[PDB]
Amino acid sequence: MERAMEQLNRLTRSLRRARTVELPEDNETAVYTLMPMVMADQHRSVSELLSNSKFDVNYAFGRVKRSLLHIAANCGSVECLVLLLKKGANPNYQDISGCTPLHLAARNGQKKCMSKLLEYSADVNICNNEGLTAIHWLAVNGRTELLHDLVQHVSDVDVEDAMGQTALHVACQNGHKTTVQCLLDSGADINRPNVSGATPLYFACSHGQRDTAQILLLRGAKYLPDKNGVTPLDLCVQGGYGETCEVLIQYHPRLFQTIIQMTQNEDLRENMLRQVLEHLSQQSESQYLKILTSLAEVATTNGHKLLSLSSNYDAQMKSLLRIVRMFCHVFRIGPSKTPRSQVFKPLELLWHSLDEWLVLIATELMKNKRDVISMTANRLSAVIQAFYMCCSCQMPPGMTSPRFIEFVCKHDEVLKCFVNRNPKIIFDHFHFLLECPELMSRFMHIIKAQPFKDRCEWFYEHLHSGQPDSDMVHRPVNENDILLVHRDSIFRSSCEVVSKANCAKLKQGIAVRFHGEEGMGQGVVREWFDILSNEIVNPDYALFTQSADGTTFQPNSNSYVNPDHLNYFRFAGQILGLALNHRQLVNIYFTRSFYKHILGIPVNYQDVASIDPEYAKNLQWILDNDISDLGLELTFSVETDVFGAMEEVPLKPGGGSILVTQNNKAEYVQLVTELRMTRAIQPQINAFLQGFHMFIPPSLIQLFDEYELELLLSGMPEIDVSDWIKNTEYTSGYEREDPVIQWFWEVVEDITQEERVLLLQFVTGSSRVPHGGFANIMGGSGLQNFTIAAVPYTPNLLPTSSTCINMLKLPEYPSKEILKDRLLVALHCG
Amino acid sequence: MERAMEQLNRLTRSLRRARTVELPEDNETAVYTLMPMVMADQHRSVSELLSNSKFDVNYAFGRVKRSLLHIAANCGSVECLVLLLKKGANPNYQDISGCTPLHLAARNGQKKCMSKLLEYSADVNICNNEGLTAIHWLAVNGRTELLHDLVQHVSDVDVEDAMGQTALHVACQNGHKTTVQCLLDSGADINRPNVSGATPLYFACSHGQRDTAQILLLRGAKYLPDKNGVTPLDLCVQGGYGETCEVLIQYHPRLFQTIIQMTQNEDLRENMLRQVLEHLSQQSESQYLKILTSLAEVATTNGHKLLSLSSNYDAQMKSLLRIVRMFCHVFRIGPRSQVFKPLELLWHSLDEWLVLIATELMKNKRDVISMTANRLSAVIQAFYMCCSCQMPPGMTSPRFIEFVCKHDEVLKCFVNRNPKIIFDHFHFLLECPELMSRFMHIIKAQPFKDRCEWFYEHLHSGQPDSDMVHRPVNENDILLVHRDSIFRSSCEVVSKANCAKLKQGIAVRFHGEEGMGQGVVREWFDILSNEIVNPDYALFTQSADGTTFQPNSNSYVNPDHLNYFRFAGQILGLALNHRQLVNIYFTRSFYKHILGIPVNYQDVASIDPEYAKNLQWILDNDISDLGLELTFSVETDVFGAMEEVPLKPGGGSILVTQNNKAEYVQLVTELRMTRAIQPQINAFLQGFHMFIPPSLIQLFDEYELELLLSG
């Protein structure tokens, strides 16, 4: 009967069990209606479809040109592909890249899908566009069980892809233990080379698969390099895998003597070759001592090479610097007692070579003294440099080695020759000198033999050296870098933010923002320094007080009233250090005493005269004439009143009744002045210097003078000598027509700008510059310009000045040249 | 040499005592050399030096031309004060700023310094250039003991400075209760007026010191405004001090009424007024209902005039919405319901004949009408919060539903005139399912271009600190994603992020590059859309046409599918939030699911036309046309397993309803289209509607949302 009944029951079974009626024969529409029942492996639906269909099962569709079987492999379905294959499906179909349905099933790791798919006469040698066959895809995810049955149906396990890598190479790259074992026992070559002639271990060490390599070596792997001749261990240290090196070194003990001799190479990173031999050193104490031992003769034989002055040195000293820096570091990290002395026996032969090397050179040079000298000095200086680091590693840091100090002293004169030749060597080769104040003082006079502004850029270079990315430009200003302060309590607010901040980031960059202000810039920080300069001179905080000079300041003795005075002192030191770090000037001038305290050199009688000239005048008399014949009451002790309380201060414990004579009056004067200057401010200056030292190391700043340090803080103000002369009064013995002042005014004119400020510091100590000219100079809060007094001339008599009244006493001289040298040595004696 | 023996003795004793005795005749040298002893209070040393000196103790020095007596007073020394004053120092000397040593002693709060200065006949009325005496500094420092000692020697306790302040006012400014107690005990004026009319109560309300106000009211203070008529209560309410208000409530029983009847002012903030009201609400339950009663007549008398008269539109309804929103807030902050019932009747009765008025509009229906509707809409809108105050939230009471449904025609007429009246006055329809849908089709008649612009305006509305004009790129807002694993990295960073951070701004960065800009965001959303459409992640599948995609059915095809489905909703919500098009393209049934309306058979035809073709054919026929076979139970196959579902719950159908196929076809389509993808739809929508609430997003149909997202 007509198809009305036939379509009625087909739609009846459609509404009853989601059954089909008919399938269109057009390829693109037929396939694009048959995903959903294959999504869940609906075997009942697809079985009914095969009953009534004329659609080929080998169709290409989509951007990848997959077949129906590829959906089954991807989805993990099993029943649909069984009936799809029964329809006549080809399991050797390929996608755009040649993807066999075996590969897609392998991509998802479907054990069941590949089992029946292979059972239907599927070729196993089909490869993708990149040459990856079936087993290559299984090696990416490393399913060993699916490898086991597949390789049983695969003729050759050494099939190479387009890149030339077998299944073993990629399996070793992924570091799967069971997969590489299964491939090797299936008949694969353990030492199969690639297109680049690389053993499978070449890729193993590149990725640092320690356990995979260990089986390969234990199974009979052969140590061979690549076609370029580079050993796998060379890439293994260049891969940074210490554990893989440990396996190689124990399997091949000859590599131990081989790894230590490539340390001379420079291409490999120093910090990355650090990790490889630290790991072997810490494996055991026996390995710890031999690695320290092995590097000892390596340094010994490398040092012998440096004794050949005719050979190249730039690469040699870098290798010597590399080894010795690493040599002491391994000793510092410690083993995994007496073995420290045991390893010193490999070290003692190193010293015996080193001490012998220089003494024959040093004796040769001193005989010559009694430019090839320049290069020879540089070479041994690195030896002298290497002479220190392994000296400093003998004991924990904190002191200089006495054995180092003894031997340096006995050749100090020879060492004094090298610093005489080139002052630039004291920083990089004599960096240890900064750690030894005792030797620093002896070489201080040599360093001061060149009072140049070159030292200014030296100090900035030394401070910025060793800091990563040490550039003061193009630094992003992050939110965390910005410090918020409030102008109502700017002095206290600035203390809080810097206390909670990080020193390293503040040294690298500066970012301070005032509350309620959005306009940011470097000028704001400059104004922040300026207002801070005006805050420290404000007596409200009671931290600094005006001197008798009237323009300089000294620490306040009664600063203990403020509870946070110590916190303010360290805060002041921190901000001044940051200003010096970032090359920011300060418009505040301080007394000579403050600069002497922070520099560390002791003060003298002239310092007392800067604040109390009357008392120093009495002290000047006592130090000139004899005191034993006078029979005064000098008993090395004084009775004083401090803070309204009576106190007796004996200058010597138990020596408070010993009469002071001419011989011992030098220390009597020094002690009483030191006690009066420093006792009332000793904790205050100690808190200030440590606050300044948290950002400026004491060793680096020690190379300056009191006048040099003030000049850096005060910048380089201009001096108009012609204007200064024309508006300066002249009285007190010397007339305006007296040639002596003309000589003095000519001397200040013809000297260098560096000498001009030095003369100004010597006569007054202040770098003041009035607005609009040099008229209207304030002396002791009163109107007073610079004046010169007249005194009789005696041999070895130098002029002296008092800044309180801007007066200087100048001995009578008959010529300008006599006046100049007397003034020049006076500047040198400042 | 000159006086050898005399100078030798001087030399030895000077060094033995560690300091010099003789002092040079230079004034500048003399003052600086004397500093190290004056701050040290070395009375014996300065006495010895002064006996051997011929200087003047009244010499002026320093920036302010201060004296030696000034330095000692600044450091707090006492004994050195006596020696200087006994040697001829003038205690009444003042600096260039008018500062006498009395002020410095007052500044340092030294009892010994001021007592000895008074003993040496020092004037107590000395003032600086600003006309401020030492009493001002003592009051600032809060030295009650020093004030009592000084006031015993001060004739005029009520002295006024340049500003007109007195010790009573300045102490109140500092908030010292002990100082004002001594001043009040001294007999000073309690209602002293300032040049602007300020009183001690004027500063009491400005600072809101509860203890000081209580003491001031205890002593018998008077209530009066200033010269400008500013009531002291105005400063107290503008200072937000509920503690002082409650104290003044006890003293003045009329204060609570006055502040409540002054609530209609517009100069004071919204949350600022709520703070004082709740402070005086939680003091006691009797006061809690008392103020609730008091605000009840204010609300009903404010709506009574809005019922009757017409005035400035913005001024009137804003005042009503101002008071009613705070009236319900204080109730929500906290037998309470029973006492609220009569308070309900004050505005419910007022609303009752508003219902009578709205009934007259239907009689009128069966432009001054528009303006009456605006006033009526606001009070009807305000009546919702009144009904919301009757019960806990989360539900819509049938009371206003009954009133609105019976009076919907005039509401429909004005909504047609002004569709935007729904957004503000009918903002309450977002929680009433019965009323959103009935007004849903009415607002659908508006053009799409007008509707979308309104939606964007209210998408960004109601968000505090919502700035869309060059928001700074914060460190936290920066999201780092790797190019190779952009899908995984973006999901991870979004999981650890917050909705509020990405709601306003957005920042995307990649490793090895510093790419930033709107294009980076556009390509980030584009690459995510391209990675989700194709089945590479096995999360979406192609449709019949091949250019459209639908979600994968089986759950856990991808292990992290639930995370991605939530993640997909998150990113698409952000794309809509920032108002840019996306290249995503889903099926029509996909938009039906995200909207809410049931999926028709046409969407089913988009996957398998033959299955829907049979369903639509039988829908147009009878039960058994041409001998058709029908069943009341259906069967579906999942994962090769055979399962049966008897259509309607409780068993198969037993009676013929709507050709016995209408609802049956609807049931089989819905069950087949959503039961297999129900859990994944919920995960997607949850991530999508958390950025845009469903009420504010369901106002568009499928076609309107498609155009705005795709373009």
Author numbering:
A (entry chain A): 1 to 336, 350 to 383, 443 to 902
B (entry chain B): 1 to 334, 352 to 383, 443 to 787
The authors write:
Here, we report a cryogenic electron microscopy (cryo-EM) structure of the full-length human HECT HACE1, along with solution-based conformational analyses by small-angle X-ray scattering and hydrogen–deuterium exchange mass spectrometry. Structure-based functional analyses in vitro and in cells reveal that the activity of HACE1 is stringently regulated by dimerization-induced autoinhibition. By contrast, HECTs form a thioester-linked intermediate with Ub before transferring it to a substrate. A RHO-family GTPase, RAC1 cycles between inactive, GDP-bound and active, GTP-bound forms, allowing for spatiotemporal regulation of its interactions and functions.
We determined a cryo-EM structure of the HACE1 dimer at 4.7 Å resolution, using AlphaFold2 (AF2)-based predictions as a starting point for model building. Each subunit of the dimer consists of a C-terminal HECT domain, flanked by an α-helical ‘middle domain’ (MID), seven ankyrin repeats (ANKs) and an N-terminal α-helix (‘N-helix’; residues 1–21). The MID and ANKs form a concave platform, above which the HECT domain leans peripherally. The subunits are arranged in a closed, head-to-tail fashion, giving rise to a ring made up of two sets of ANKs, MIDs and small wings of the HECT N-lobes (for HECT domain architecture). The large wings of the N-lobes are juxtaposed on the inside of the ring, giving rise to a yin–yang-like overall arrangement. The catalytic C-lobes protrude above the platforms, with one adopting an inverted-T conformation (molecule A). In the cryo-EM structure, dimerization is largely mediated by contacts of the N-helix of one subunit with the small wing of the HECT N-lobe of the other, with minor contributions from the N-terminal ANK. The structure of HACE1 FL provides a rationale for how dimerization inhibits the two-step catalytic cycle: at the subunit interface, the N-helix engages intermolecularly with a region of the HECT N-lobe that coincides with the conserved E2 binding site. Although this site, including a key phenylalanine (Phe715), is conserved in HACE1, it is occluded in the dimer. The binding mode is incompatible with the HACE1 dimer, highlighting another layer of autoinhibition.
